[PDB]
Structure 1
Amino acid sequence: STQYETQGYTINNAGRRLVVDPITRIEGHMRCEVNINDQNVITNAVSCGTMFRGLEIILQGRDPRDAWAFVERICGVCTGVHALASVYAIEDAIGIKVPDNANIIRNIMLATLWCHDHLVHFYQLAGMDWIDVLDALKADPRKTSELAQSLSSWPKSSPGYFFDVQNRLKKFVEGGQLGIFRNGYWGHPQYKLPPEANLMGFAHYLEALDFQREIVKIHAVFGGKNPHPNWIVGGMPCAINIDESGAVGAVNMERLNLVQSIITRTADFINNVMIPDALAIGQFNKPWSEIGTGLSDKCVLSYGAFPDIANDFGEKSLLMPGGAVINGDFNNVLPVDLVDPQQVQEFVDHAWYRYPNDQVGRHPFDGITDPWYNPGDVKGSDTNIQQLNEQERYSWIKAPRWRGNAMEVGPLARTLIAYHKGDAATVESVDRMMSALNLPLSGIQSTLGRILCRAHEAQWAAGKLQYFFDKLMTNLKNGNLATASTEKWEPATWPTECRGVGFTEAPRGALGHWAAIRDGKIDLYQCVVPTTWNASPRDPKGQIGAYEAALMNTKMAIPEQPLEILRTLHSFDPCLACSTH
């Protein structure tokens, strides 16, 4: 066994090794291994992406106008976010400016995704780490009603309703066909909600599974379908016609009425179901404000997102702030430049890829995606991994760093960046939220904090949906209908050689697509995706990524039941298809 020091952690692979493969209730394929000491405390954590498809390779030789459709298929969970990054990147390379309505609609698409992706994560993915579903069977329906009504004005709270939900769960379980609940961690000492709260949460899990389907109707109006809506380089394809012949063939007042109806319902659900549930999880699980800190008190990164001035990606335009903090120095939020070769670099010395020199990091404009499955000395064989060898190559995920620093990205990262840039709304919201839980600010920098920030962001995004919709309606009232710029649609109008960067904040964090065009075709296309940052393997200095750091130092009650590991990993909302692409 070996031991070394990095980022204030002691990485020690002595002691019992635990393996969790597959990681479930994530998107895609992940393996996690840890070592635990004699006190059942994690002294080593190993994050492994167990899939690869090679979109960066597939994109070579494609028409830049087609790229968004290919890269959208990086992920069907954060569906649309790669298409947005792609059209931004191609427009940046070619020198295309889109009309205001196109930008507004794109912002709507992204805010819709944030609302949907965050809501479903909270209930369908992370929910069962916090809610003991089987324990809901012991709840008193009247006490459940009283609890729900004490937390929220949400209408659906009658004793009869909770009794009906409980009875349906009873009948579901009674025949022994437990489906998704089979062989779960129910009864684990870390489940701390009373039975009434478990029934309330389970009822809401079902309500959210039903309701999420409605949110994406906004993507269907503007983008044709969800998952995987359509886009164009130059704007959006959803031509608008309000008051002219043929409005039946376009985005018209009836289509806009539908969108408005969805926005209102989405805000209602997030504000009155998700938000109180998140705060309730906080109230009953305060020790988790001190677990899973990882890099969140050291290094956090946001590119920023939601440009409110069309075609302006500067600080004054982006509604969601960008910046970087390193070395725990939150008094100095640093500017980020995605073209600077000394800023974003990816290392592969611990990943399954070939570089000419694996001891150096490559900026994505110099990126290489040459897969090389080489696990070295596992316990087992090349096709039977019993234990990954984290001293060599152990993942399909590349290792991104910012100025050589390992960074956390995502809702907690963004919240910290906005807070410390002095965003008045963020400061007010965060302060009020931590006050309600009687926790210090530092309590946000934790597994519990990731979940709270995600809920906060869903609420923020639902509000922004109305803001963007009102912006769109204002343009229409002023007779501004344009949704596409086609001046540079034809390849004959393009520079022979150009490159561009498209960036945004996907639900899970900082997303960038770097594209180089030559002779009308994609010459290079490199993606660095939020889960690539968070699920990163180690670098040449042995520095650990966000997941590995968040797992470090964690006490497990029952080693063979990895509930604490799942809680912390799920708090980041891992998307492994995104991470590996």
Structure 2
Amino acid sequence: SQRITIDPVTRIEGHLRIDCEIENGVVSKAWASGTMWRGMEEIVKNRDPRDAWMIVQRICGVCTTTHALSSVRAAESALNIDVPVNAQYIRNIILAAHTTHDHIVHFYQLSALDWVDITSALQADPTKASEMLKGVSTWHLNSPEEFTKVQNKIKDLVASGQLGIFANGYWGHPAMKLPPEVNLIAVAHYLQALESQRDANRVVALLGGKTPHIQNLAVGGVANPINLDGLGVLNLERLMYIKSFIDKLSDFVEQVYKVDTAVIAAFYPEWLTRGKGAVNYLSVPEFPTDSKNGSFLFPGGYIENADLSSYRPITSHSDEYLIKGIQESAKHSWYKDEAPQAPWEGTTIPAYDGWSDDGKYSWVKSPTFYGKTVEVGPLANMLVKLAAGRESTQNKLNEIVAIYQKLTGNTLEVAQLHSTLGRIIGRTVHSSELQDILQNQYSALITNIGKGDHTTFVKPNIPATGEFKGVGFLEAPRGMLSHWMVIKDGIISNYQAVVPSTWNSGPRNFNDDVGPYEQSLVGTPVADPNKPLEVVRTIHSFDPCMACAVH
């Protein structure tokens, strides 16, 4: 029996502390803590509703774009503005391409070194490694020659004595299970991923004006001026350039990222049977395509008690059932007001008093849906799509399963998706489906401009009296995001963000119920309490972002 702390948790965005009680070699109880606060909700208060998005985008630069888009949607909700369809297409392209970058970086730069041992890679035979992937991937950069160059770079790094970010890593740990050859394959893919994520952000930059932190939005649409015949604006040459980067993403996603996901599951199959965070899941529909902020390409919904068969669909960002369920508590958080609050009536009054196991121990609030804890993010979004009978999602999941089957002789059932590896699989499925979103929305944009519609912006009016409430929903890389704006006498009188990492990472709630990160760790085997790799494996599967969770 003993008490450990993991502080800082690395290979996440932001500042996270995890504490665990370990009994008889397994975690028996856990605490998640966000250790940095800025007060972004207070910073944006009393400003013009049109300004909010440029300020609150700075909640996070990893999930850049997301808070910007959620903020304009919130002001649009309050003001009753219908966004021009060309502005929906542009916003959708940006979100889809951003998310592609975000998920690739998570799987490789943030998560792979939980599962992959770089020292073991030095022992690999590059020819045997290449041979292992025959009939498993058609990727053009799995040759022995590619793998030998990568092995030599690792060799040179180790020989210099300056391991830097690779130093004091969990090399030779008993939970590291890959053969040398598979370790070398993963490091080669890690480096290749950096090129493909750059291509995704070239899409974002051409519409956003730069990334991180896009600058093309507005309450009322976008600032891109569509004119096929115009010099220095969004013309056909610029659109062709965008398309040239969209076309570069699919092969990496399908032939490297999707395959590696199945390979990791095949070598770590006990991770299909642990890391369950919740029994309830929530996602919002995303990528609207009509003239009235609807007709979403991806569905949403609510699953209760893991029952896909009886889920409740959500098809609108104005759904009163969704809106009315959401509250946050600060009983075990460092804020003053503790009872559950609907976010239009939310407060964020700091009340730091240090760490207590049974009192306050985090800057993250505790969100609930009609009083229940809920997991959000790619596992939620996948399970909802399967519940909706979405064929695209079923088919892509089956492709990952088939690779797993071929490697192990075993299959994967939906029950095994409620796990650390299931969560990773949801993220990979999302990434693959986003490539069809990109092709679909580029084609829609080209077709619509061809009909003679170049409209991008509806100038808002904001009444100087009255009190108006708006909420902007968005299915972000890490799950359902919502910004809640109250306008009074022309200015922002309340602003509250409820962010996907808030739902997952938040501490024990008003009824002392346990949220997803803390719940997922119960039962985790920990072979060496001084080097708790197994805990970090499960926490990474949620893709934590603490600037997002706390703001």
Q: Given the two structures, how large is their TM-score scaled by the length of structure 2?
A: 0.95
Mapped to 1, the partners of 2:285 and 2:450 lie a distance apart of: 30
163, 167, 173: which one pairs with 1:182?
A: 167
Shift of 1:507: 0.2
Mapped to 1, the partners of 2:225 and 2:499 lie a distance apart of: 31
**Are 1:454 and 2:389 matched, yes or no?**
no
Corresponding position of 1:75: 60
Secondary structure (helix, strand or coil) at the match of 2:364 reads coil
Letter aligned with residue 498 of structure 2:
V
Secondary structure (helix, strand or coil) at the match of 1:248 reads coil
Corresponding position of 1:302: 283
Indicate the larger mover: 183-192 or 501-510: 183-192
Check the 8 A contact 1:338/1:344 in 2, yes or no: no
Mapped to 2, the partners of 1:495 and 1:241 lie a distance apart of: 38
Secondary structure (helix, strand or coil) at the match of 2:474 reads strand
Letter aligned with residue 25 of structure 1:
R
Corresponding position of 1:236: 222
Corresponding position of 1:370: 349
Structure 1 unpaired stretches of 5+: 1-14, 376-387
Which aligned pairs between 1:208-223 and structure 2 lie closer than 5 A? 208-223=193-208
7, 14, 39: which one pairs with 1:54?
A: 39
Shift of 1:425: 2.4
Corresponding position of 1:567: 537
Check the 8 A contact 1:267/1:463 in 2, yes or no: no
396, 404, 407: which one pairs with 1:429?
A: 396
**Residues 32-60 of structure 1: CA deviation (Å, up to 9, x unaligned):** 0010112x111101110111111110111
Shift of 1:22: 0.2
422, 437, 444: which one pairs with 1:464?
A: 437
**Residues 412-431 of structure 1: CA deviation (Å, up to 9, x unaligned):** 01111111122232233334
* Alignment CA distance shift 1:69-1:197 (3 Å): same
Shift of 1:545: 0.5
Mapped to 2, the partners of 1:213 and 1:176 lie a distance apart of: 30
Letter aligned with residue 325 of structure 1:
I
Secondary structure (helix, strand or coil) at the match of 2:497 reads strand
Shift of 1:259: 0.8
Structure 2 unpaired stretches of 5+: 405-410
Corresponding position of 1:518: 488
Shift of 1:343: 0.7
244, 248, 261: which one pairs with 1:278?
A: 261
Check the 8 A contact 1:419/1:427 in 2, yes or no: yes
Letter aligned with residue 151 of structure 1:
V
509, 519, 528: which one pairs with 1:549?
A: 519
Mapped to 2, the partners of 1:339 and 1:440 lie a distance apart of: 31
* Alignment CA distance shift 1:560-1:348 (3 Å): same
**Residues 334-368 of structure 1: CA deviation (Å, up to 9, x unaligned):** 3564676751010100000011xx2x200101100
Mapped to 2, the partners of 1:210 and 1:433 lie a distance apart of: 23
Corresponding position of 1:361: 340
Corresponding position of 2:382: 415
Shift of 1:326: 2.0
Secondary structure (helix, strand or coil) at the match of 2:310 reads coil
Indicate the larger mover: 569-578 or 249-258: 249-258
127, 141, 149: which one pairs with 1:142?
A: 127
Instruction: Let me know the Cα RMSD of the aligned residues.
Output: 1.6
Secondary structure (helix, strand or coil) at the match of 1:73 reads helix
Corresponding position of 1:502: 472
Corresponding position of 1:10: none
Check the 8 A contact 1:341/1:363 in 2, yes or no: no
Mapped to 2, the partners of 1:341 and 1:65 lie a distance apart of: 23
Letter aligned with residue 531 of structure 1:
S
Mapped to 1, the partners of 2:504 and 2:206 lie a distance apart of: 33
Corresponding position of 1:319: 297
Check the 8 A contact 2:392/2:433 in 1, yes or no: no
Shift of 1:209: 1.8
Check the 8 A contact 2:65/2:94 in 1, yes or no: yes
Shift of 1:133: 1.6
Shift of 1:96: 1.3
Secondary structure (helix, strand or coil) at the match of 1:68 reads helix
Check the 8 A contact 1:85/1:503 in 2, yes or no: yes
Shift of 1:291: 1.4
Letter aligned with residue 221 of structure 2:
G
Mapped to 2, the partners of 1:341 and 1:228 lie a distance apart of: 28
Mapped to 1, the partners of 2:402 and 2:135 lie a distance apart of: 18
Shift of 1:101: 0.4
Corresponding position of 1:384: none
Mapped to 2, the partners of 1:272 and 1:47 lie a distance apart of: 36
**Are 1:478 and 2:451 matched, yes or no?**
yes
Mapped to 2, the partners of 1:73 and 1:56 lie a distance apart of: 11
* Alignment CA distance shift 1:321-1:152 (3 Å): same
Corresponding position of 1:536: 506
Number of aligned pairs?
Answer: 540
Corresponding position of 2:87: 102
Corresponding position of 1:197: 182
Mapped to 2, the partners of 1:513 and 1:69 lie a distance apart of: 14
Which aligned pairs between 1:379-418 and structure 2 lie closer than 5 A? 388-418=355-385
**Residues 165-218 of structure 1: CA deviation (Å, up to 9, x unaligned):** 101110111121001111111111111111111111101101112331221111
Percent of aligned pairs with the same amino acid: 45
415, 422, 427: which one pairs with 1:442?
A: 415
**Residues 379-403 of structure 1: CA deviation (Å, up to 9, x unaligned):** xxxxxxxxx4221000000000001
Corresponding position of 2:27: 42
* Alignment CA distance shift 1:547-1:415 (3 Å): same
Check the 8 A contact 1:326/1:405 in 2, yes or no: no
**Residues 398-455 of structure 1: CA deviation (Å, up to 9, x unaligned):** 0000011000000001111111122232233334533543122211111011111111
Mapped to 2, the partners of 1:341 and 1:104 lie a distance apart of: 25
Mapped to 2, the partners of 1:361 and 1:52 lie a distance apart of: 20
Q: Given the two structures, how large is their TM-score scaled by the length of structure 1?
A: 0.90
Letter aligned with residue 439 of structure 2:
Q
Mapped to 1, the partners of 2:451 and 2:465 lie a distance apart of: 35
Shift of 1:310: 3.4
Corresponding position of 1:382: none
Corresponding position of 2:306: 328
Letter aligned with residue 441 of structure 1:
V
Mapped to 2, the partners of 1:177 and 1:219 lie a distance apart of: 35
Check the 8 A contact 1:16/1:36 in 2, yes or no: yes
Mapped to 2, the partners of 1:145 and 1:431 lie a distance apart of: 24
Mapped to 1, the partners of 2:527 and 2:78 lie a distance apart of: 53
**Residues 258-314 of structure 1: CA deviation (Å, up to 9, x unaligned):** 11111110122211221111111111111111111221xx1111122212223334x
**Are 1:255 and 2:238 matched, yes or no?**
yes
Mapped to 2, the partners of 1:449 and 1:340 lie a distance apart of: 25
Secondary structure (helix, strand or coil) at the match of 1:415 reads helix
Letter aligned with residue 75 of structure 1:
C
Corresponding position of 2:408: none
